[PDB]
Amino acid sequence: HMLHWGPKYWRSLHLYAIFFSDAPSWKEKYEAIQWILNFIESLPCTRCQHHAFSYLTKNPLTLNNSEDFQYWTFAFHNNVNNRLNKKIISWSEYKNIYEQSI
Amino acid sequence: GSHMLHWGPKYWRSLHLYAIFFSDAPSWKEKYEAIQWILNFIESLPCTRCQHHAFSYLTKNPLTLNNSEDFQYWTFAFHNNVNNRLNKKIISWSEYKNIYEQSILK
Ligand SMILES: Cc1cc2nc3c(=O)[nH]c(=O)nc-3n(C[C@H](O)[C@H](O)[C@H](O)COP(=O)(O)OP(=O)(O)OC[C@H]3O[C@@H](n4cnc5c(N)ncnc54)[C@H](O)[C@@H]3O)c2cc1C
Ligand SMILES: Cc1cc2nc3c(=O)[nH]c(=O)nc-3n(C[C@H](O)[C@H](O)[C@H](O)COP(=O)(O)OP(=O)(O)OC[C@H]3O[C@@H](n4cnc5c(N)ncnc54)[C@H](O)[C@@H]3O)c2cc1C
Numbered sequence: 001h002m003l004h005w006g007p008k009y010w011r012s013l014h015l016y017a018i019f020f021s022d023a024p025s026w027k028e029k030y031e032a033i034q035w036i037l038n039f040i041e042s043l044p045c046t047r048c049q050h051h052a053f054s055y056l057t058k059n060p061l062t063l064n065n066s067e068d069f070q071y072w073t074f075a076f077h078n079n080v081n082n083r084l085n086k087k088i089i090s091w092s093e094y095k096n097i098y099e100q101s102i
Numbered sequence: 103g104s105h106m107l108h109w110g111p112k113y114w115r116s117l118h119l120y121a122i123f124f125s126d127a128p129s130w131k132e133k134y135e136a137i138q139w140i141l142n143f144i145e146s147l148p149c150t151r152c153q154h155h156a157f158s159y160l161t162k163n164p165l166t167l168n169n170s171e172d173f174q175y176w177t178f179a180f181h182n183n184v185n186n187r188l189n190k191k192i193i194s195w196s197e198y199k200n201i202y203e204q205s206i207l208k
Contacts, residue, residue, distance in 0.1 A: 025130065026129065026130035026131040026133075026134055027130040029130075029134055030130050030133050030134045030137070033134060033137055033138075034137070034164065037137075037160065037161050037164070038161070038164075040161055041161035041162060049157075049161075050154060050157075053157045056141065057141045057142065057144065057145040058145070060138065
C-alpha cells in the first residue's frame with residue numbers, strides 16, 4: 001500500500017518546502033505548520049501518522065527560509081529511512097534528486 | 103499507572119487557561135506559538151493512548167485561533183470529545199463560562 005503512495009506523499013512534502021519563501025512572514029510560517037499537520041492527517045497509514053507526530057513534537061519545524069525547511073524534511077525523511085533500514089542519503093544526493101525543482 | 107483521575111484535571115486546566123489568556127487580536131506569531139504549545143501540551147500527557155487520541159483529534163479539527171473565545175471553544179469542544187469517549191458528562195458552553203468566569207476578564 002504505502003510502497004506506492006509513500007513516494008508520492010514524500011514528494012509532496014519536499015516540494016512544499018522547496019516552494020516555501022526565503023523571507024517568510026509569520027503568516028507563511030503559520031500556514032506551513034498547519035500544512036504539515038494536514039499532511040500528516042492525509043497519510044493513509046496508522047503507524048506512519050503516529051511516528052510522524054512524535055517526530056514533529058520532538059523536532060520543531062525550522063522555517064527561517066526554504067532550505068531550512070528543506071533540510072527539516074530531509075532529516076525527517078532520513079529518520080524514517082533509518083527506521084525502515086533504508087538507505088540514509090547524503091545532503092549532496094538530496095540536492096541532485098531535487099536539483100531541477102530547487 | 104497513569105493515574106489520570108488526579109493528573110487529568112491539571113492538564114485540562116492548563117489547556118483552558120492558555121486559551122483564556124490568548125490575545126483577542128493575536129499576531130500571526132502568537133498563533134504560530136499557540137500551535138507549537140498545543141503540540142508540546144500533547145507530548146507532555148502522561149499516557150500514550152491519551153497522546154494518540156489528542157493527536158488524532160487535532161489533525162481532524164484544526165485549531166481555531168482568530169481570538170481567545172475561538173481558541174477557548176476549541177479546547178472546550180476537545181474536552182467534551184474526551185468526556186464523550188469516557189462516557190462522562192458533556193457540559194454546556196454556558197456552564198464552561200460559569201466554571202472559568204473568574205479568569206475570563208476578556
Ligand atoms: C511522512 C511519511 C511517513 C512514513 N512512515 C512510514 C512508517 O512509519 N512505516 C512504514 O512502513 N512506512 C512509512 N512510510 C513509507 C516509506 O517512508 C516509503 O515511502 C515506502 O516504504 C516506499 O519506500 P521507497 O523505497 O520507495 O522510498 P521513499 O518512498 O522512502 O523514496 C522516496 C524517493 O525519495 C528519495 N529520498 C530518499 N531518502 C530521502 C530523503 N531523506 N530526502 C529527500 N528524498 C529522499 C529517493 O529518490 C527515493 O526513491 C511513510 C511515508 C511518509 C510520506
Ligand atoms: C488531552 C487529554 C486527553 C486525555 N485522555 C484520556 C484517556 O484517553 N483516557 C482516560 O482514562 N483519561 C484521559 N484523560 C483524562 C480525563 O479527561 C479526565 O481528566 C479524568 O478522567 C478525570 O475526570 P474529571 O471527572 O475530574 O474531570 P476532567 O474532565 O478532569 O475535569 C476538569 C473539570 O473541568 C470542567 N469541565 C468538564 N468538561 C469540560 C469542558 N468541555 N470544557 C472545559 N471544562 C470542562 C469541570 O469543572 C471539571 O470537573 C485526558 C486528559 C487530557 C488533558
